[PDB]
Amino acid sequence: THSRYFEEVNLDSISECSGPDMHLGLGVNPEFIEFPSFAPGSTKPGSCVRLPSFSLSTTVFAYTHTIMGHGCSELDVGDHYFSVGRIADAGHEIPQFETISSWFINDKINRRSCTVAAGAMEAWMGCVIMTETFYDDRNSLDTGKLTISYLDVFGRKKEWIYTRSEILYDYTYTSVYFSVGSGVVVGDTVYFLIWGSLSSPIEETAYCFAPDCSNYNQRMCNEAQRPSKFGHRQMVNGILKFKTTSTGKPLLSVGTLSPSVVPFGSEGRLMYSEITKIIYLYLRSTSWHALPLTGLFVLGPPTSISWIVQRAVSRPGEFPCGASNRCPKDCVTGVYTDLFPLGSRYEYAATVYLNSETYRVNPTLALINQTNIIASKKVTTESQRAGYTTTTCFVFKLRVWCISVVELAPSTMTAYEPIPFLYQLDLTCKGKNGSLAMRFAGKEGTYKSGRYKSPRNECFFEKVSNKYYFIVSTPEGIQPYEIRDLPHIIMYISDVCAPALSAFKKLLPAMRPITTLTIGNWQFRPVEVSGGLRVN
Amino acid sequence: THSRYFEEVNLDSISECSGPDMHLGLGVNPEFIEFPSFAPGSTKPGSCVRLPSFSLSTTVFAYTHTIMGHGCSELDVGDHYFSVGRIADAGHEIPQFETISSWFINDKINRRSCTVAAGAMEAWMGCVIMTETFYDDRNSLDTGKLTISYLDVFGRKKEWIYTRSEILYDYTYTSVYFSVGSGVVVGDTVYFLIWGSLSSPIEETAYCFAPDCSNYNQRMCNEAQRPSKFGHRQMVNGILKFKTTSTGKPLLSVGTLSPSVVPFGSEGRLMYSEITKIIYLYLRSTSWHALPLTGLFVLGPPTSISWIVQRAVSRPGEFPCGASNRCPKDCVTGVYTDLFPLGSRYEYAATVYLNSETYRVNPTLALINQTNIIASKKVTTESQRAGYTTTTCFVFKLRVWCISVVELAPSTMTAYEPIPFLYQLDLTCKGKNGSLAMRFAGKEGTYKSGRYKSPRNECFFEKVSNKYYFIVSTPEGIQPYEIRDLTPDRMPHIIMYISDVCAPALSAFKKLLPAMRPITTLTIGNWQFRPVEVSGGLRVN
Ligand SMILES: *[C@@H]1O[C@H](CO)[C@@H](O[C@@H]2O[C@H](CO)[C@@H](O[C@@H]3O[C@H](CO[C@H]4O[C@H](CO)[C@@H](O)[C@H](O)[C@@H]4O)[C@@H](O)[C@H](O[C@H]4O[C@H](CO)[C@@H](O)[C@H](O)[C@@H]4O)[C@@H]3O)[C@H](O)[C@H]2NC(C)=O)[C@H](O)[C@H]1NC(C)=O
Ligand SMILES: *[C@@H]1O[C@H](CO)[C@@H](O[C@@H]2O[C@H](CO)[C@@H](O[C@@H]3O[C@H](CO[C@H]4O[C@H](CO)[C@@H](O)[C@H](O)[C@@H]4O)[C@@H](O)[C@H](O)[C@@H]3O)[C@H](O)[C@H]2NC(C)=O)[C@H](O)[C@H]1NC(C)=O
Numbered sequence A: 001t002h003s004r005y006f007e008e009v010n011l012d013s014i015s016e017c018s019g020p021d022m023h024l025g026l027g028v029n030p031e032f033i034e035f036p037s038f039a040p041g042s043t044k045p046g047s048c049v050r051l052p053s054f055s056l057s058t059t060v061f062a063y064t065h066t067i068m069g070h071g072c073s074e075l076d077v078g079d080h081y082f083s084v085g086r087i088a089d090a091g092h093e094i095p096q097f098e099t100i101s102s103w104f105i106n107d108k109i110n111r112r113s114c115t116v117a118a119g120a121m122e123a124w125m126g127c128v129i130m131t132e133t134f135y136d137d138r139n140s141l142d143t144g145k146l147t148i149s150y151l152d153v154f155g156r157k158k159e160w161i162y163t164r165s166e167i168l169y170d171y172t173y174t175s176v177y178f179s180v181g182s183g184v185v186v187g188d189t190v191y192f193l194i195w196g197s198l199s200s201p202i203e204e205t206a207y208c209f210a211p212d213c214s215n216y217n218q219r220m221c222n223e224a225q226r227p228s229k230f231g232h233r234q235m236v237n238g239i240l241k242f243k244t245t246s247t248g249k250p251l252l253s254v255g256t257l258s259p260s261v262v263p264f265g266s267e268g269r270l271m272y273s274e275i276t277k278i279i280y281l282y283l284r285s286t287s288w289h290a291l292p293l294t295g296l297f298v299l300g301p302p303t304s305i306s307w308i309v310q311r312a313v314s315r316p317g318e319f320p321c322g323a324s325n326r327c328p329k330d331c332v333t334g335v336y337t338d339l340f341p342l343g344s345r346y347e348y349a350a351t352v353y354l355n356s357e358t359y360r361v362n363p364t365l366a367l368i369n370q371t372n373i374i375a376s377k378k379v380t381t382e383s384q385r386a387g388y389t390t391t392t393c394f395v396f397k398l399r400v401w402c403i404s405v406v407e408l409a410p411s412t413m414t415a416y417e418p419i420p421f422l423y424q425l426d427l428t429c430k431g432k433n434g435s436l437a438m439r440f441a442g443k444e445g446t447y448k449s450g451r452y453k454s455p456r457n458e459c460f461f462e463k464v465s466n467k468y469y470f471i472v473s474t475p476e477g478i479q480p481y482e483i484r485d486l487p488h489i490i491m492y493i494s495d496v497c498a499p500a501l502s503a504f505k506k507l508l509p510a511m512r513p514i515t516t517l518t519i520g521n522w523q524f525r526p527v528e529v530s531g532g533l534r535v536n
Numbered sequence B: 001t002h003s004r005y006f007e008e009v010n011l012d013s014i015s016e017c018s019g020p021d022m023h024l025g026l027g028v029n030p031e032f033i034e035f036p037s038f039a040p041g042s043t044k045p046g047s048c049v050r051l052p053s054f055s056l057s058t059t060v061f062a063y064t065h066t067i068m069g070h071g072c073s074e075l076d077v078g079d080h081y082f083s084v085g086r087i088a089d090a091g092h093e094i095p096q097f098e099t100i101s102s103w104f105i106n107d108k109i110n111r112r113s114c115t116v117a118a119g120a121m122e123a124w125m126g127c128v129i130m131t132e133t134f135y136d137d138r139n140s141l142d143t144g145k146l147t148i149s150y151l152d153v154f155g156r157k158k159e160w161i162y163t164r165s166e167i168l169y170d171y172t173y174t175s176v177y178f179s180v181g182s183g184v185v186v187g188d189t190v191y192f193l194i195w196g197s198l199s200s201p202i203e204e205t206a207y208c209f210a211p212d213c214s215n216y217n218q219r220m221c222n223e224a225q226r227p228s229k230f231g232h233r234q235m236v237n238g239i240l241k242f243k244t245t246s247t248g249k250p251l252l253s254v255g256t257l258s259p260s261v262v263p264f265g266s267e268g269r270l271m272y273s274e275i276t277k278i279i280y281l282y283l284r285s286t287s288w289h290a291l292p293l294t295g296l297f298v299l300g301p302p303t304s305i306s307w308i309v310q311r312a313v314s315r316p317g318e319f320p321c322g323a324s325n326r327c328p329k330d331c332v333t334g335v336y337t338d339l340f341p342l343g344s345r346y347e348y349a350a351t352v353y354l355n356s357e358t359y360r361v362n363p364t365l366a367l368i369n370q371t372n373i374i375a376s377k378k379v380t381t382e383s384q385r386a387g388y389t390t391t392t393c394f395v396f397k398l399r400v401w402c403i404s405v406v407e408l409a410p411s412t413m414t415a416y417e418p419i420p421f422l423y424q425l426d427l428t429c430k431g432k433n434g435s436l437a438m439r440f441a442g443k444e445g446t447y448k449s450g451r452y453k454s455p456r457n458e459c460f461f462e463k464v465s466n467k468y469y470f471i472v473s474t475p476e477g478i479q480p481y482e483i484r485d486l487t488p489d490r491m492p493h494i495i496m497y498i499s500d501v502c503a504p505a506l507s508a509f510k511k512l513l514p515a516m517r518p519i520t521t522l523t524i525g526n527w528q529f530r531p532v533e534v535s536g537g538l539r540v541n
């Protein structure tokens, strides 16, 4: 079909090379590649782009970010960006993200916690509206007023505004928020992940599975489930289901997950694999279980969740509920850092987590294997401030790629700005023999190993200010030299890059203050020259 | 539908109320509107987006920005963003910019000074390539390697690479660079503005006009033409012309402007108006003429330029040639800040200039005549660093709008980032009576006066953390208030709506100065509102 990717393949999560004989790792360190960002920046000073939501299906992908105006305030939340696009081939091994349709919402009504679900050549956006024109001092739970938007690759834009009565709730909620993590569409049913407080308790038996707590009790568990904030109402998680084959306004149903399996109802992401027929469930830890809440969710009655222990990363938060905290405590704090599953049962994962323990700073890309971190790479710097992070991986031209959008603070004129990063995960599983024990394969074929292209290590001549200069271009740095000696003899680049590269790779920390000349009359001196129009 | 904007028309012509009885100004203060930026940001921490080029024709607009990689270095210049799009109507008075086709160049060859020119349903891009695999210590003319890219609204892409011999040069150049300011397409001919050093001097006296200089000499004028940095080669300006509808590779011709009219050859912008049939020419001042170099180019078989004196803004520069030197000195420095003409003969102009004297900081939007500044507004802060600025104005639904893309520094992860700003210029011409003596008109009708919509002055109830509270949203600030029952209806439980308390609360909120609303209890009717700052527990800010 048109307006759809082709070389895009879901990860073969059967890539579980377990057993002590085989060890999984990365062959080539991931490198951030430059491409036109599908997340357009803000143009009004003060208005910040935040809360990114990215979903990838087997046909198209969808993206959404909220533009909080009036100095990055959560009270002017009516301006959003909703886009549907597709990955594409541009004649190279680099997947090129393409935006085909975009729906820039600019109405006045405040829509918060806008999540996205990429479907079959279409996308659904779930937001909620808490603003109300009337007020009653008596107890009067306002309609959740959630809006479901519908954007197709053909430019079609539709939307429905629901009330509390139209939606089928199994239990009465006090407030309903969409999890900023992406929804998922399977078959004819779109499922979104929601979280909210219930008016009355249900099981009163919290998750109460302490990861590494020495002293804990059940009362602490069920007390943390109903924090002091939100009015001591149990924060539970639920699934919103509505069918795409419905005429006009879709019918909505809500199935609330039992509080015994969900530790704390908060934001989270739903991912589904056609290769596995499994819906992996990520749940952001906004309470005490700072260790990542990954699990495998089972559709259809009876709905079942299998939580998986992750002890390689964590989410920063305020004391006493920051990283390294393992005991149940009444607290609401944390950050959204999802973990994309790279195994059939979350055996291996790829994520962009905040390395700090308390302050939400230092974004770091990392591949984990539940026990440790297989590999790691800092996004920018250690002092970099960050916010929500989302990560989604795919396969393009028999190579595993990943796109990770992270909120970064500050910005050029705003407080936050979600920026995407495309990188290659050269997954390699090798034995004790030091050799690759197995080559990961898929339906399209065996995944290729190595870099998509050889590193650029060239040397050329460049004219600046009517003067020619030798240029050594290496992946670690580019240095210009000035030719300073001789119509009797002419020359070209010939083979001077490699002899210069050999000495330039060793004296790289010294920035090569000397230059080994040639036997001929030619010679060059290392000087830094710049254009006259931009001194910078 | 079609792939062009509707209800968009050019300005000028009617803006001729230059009579001393009538003064021209702005009615409503310009406000930056939020829209999805058609300048996509960078995704690599090392590569920085820079050198924006924006062109707007009578059908579509074109944009281009260069991604300098390897730590924002001007040596890794192979990535470029080329886009063609259109304005559109979304049921509002706001001009919504729409990007139709985008061509992300990612070759390895270094292309510097990439200029764009919009026209009909397509756009042309002119870049140069100074990289050469060959080299000669003796003086040899390098291949021009001019690359002309071609992008249509249907996604069609084409490109040509030229040679020093294929192009028709009236004089032998040593180096040729495209002016970052946008080109223009008239009829079937695409005109770009180029600048460069000549191998041999034409030996013509410079512009040699004195912007209020007590002492200047003829030789001082000729010194700036041939600076020491470029090897005493006269920096001249020329026009590259190539015709569309040509077979295969289009033929390129170069017409060098005489050094008598052009003071110093550097970057510049060409803008042509269908209503006026004139090509207004901006020239970036990179020498001593710190005053903005605006002029009116005519396409006559004899090339002719008439420069218009502007004494309202200037460009920051080094100590010998700053924004206040204005007298002939041998120097090469400055910044690109073009001025979009709002008059038939550059009578009024709109720009975003750097208000500082030396450092390229403090970007400031300003509308000027030929002597002073009509109105001014800083973009963000005074300490904001900036770079190149480009500005293009138009009409949408009988309203004067302007888009200004300026380089801002620093960025989120790069050194530079071009960001656009959309604002409305409420041009009003009136006399001392104080009543509007002139209503600006156009082909579609009289340009409407006033703000595009009434300012948002709303009040509403919002529930956060299961707690309802008042929210007063005004254009100056948004304040939440805790609702409390001041014995209303002789019962604690009550029902109140927005329209019953919003208008007087808005009146009281506008009177209270900043830092007073978040501490002042607002009591009205039978309800007490207490300014309390509360946010959701998900994200603390
Ligand atoms: C999750 O992923 C992490 C990634 O670090 C794994 O943690 C490491 O696991 C390894 C075992 O797989 C631990 O032991 C290390 O083994 C190396 C040798 O491994 C085999 O391979 C070589 C050939 O490739 C053979 O020569 C050798 O006999 C082994 O059969 C050693 O190299 C490591 O330590 C030494 O390395 C060099 C010398 O090569 C020395 O200079 C170093 O100083 C060092 O002494 C090491 O012994 C390793 O310790 C684990 N690291 C951590 C941080 O825990 C997890 O196992 C994995 N979890 C899973 C899969 O469940
Ligand atoms: C080129 O642009 C300049 C800026 O637009 C023009 O300057 C303006 O010229 C008019 C001519 O009438 C002056 O109008 C008079 O101004 C005074 C004062 O008005 C207010 O402004 C001053 C600012 O210093 C302030 O001190 C006062 O308190 C007032 O608030 C009135 O008394 C008169 O009635 C009359 O309107 C403008 O003042 C003047 N503006 C500035 C900033 O100098 C200039 O005329 C243009 N040139 C041409 C040839 O058109």
Ligand SMILES: *[C@@H]1O[C@H](CO)[C@@H](O)[C@H](O)[C@H]1NC(C)=O
Residues within 6 Å of the ligand: B431, B432, B433, B435, B436, B437
């Ligand atoms: C302003 O007032 C005068 C009073 O004589 C009047 O004649 C004129 O028409 C009015 N309007 C103008 C000058 O635009």
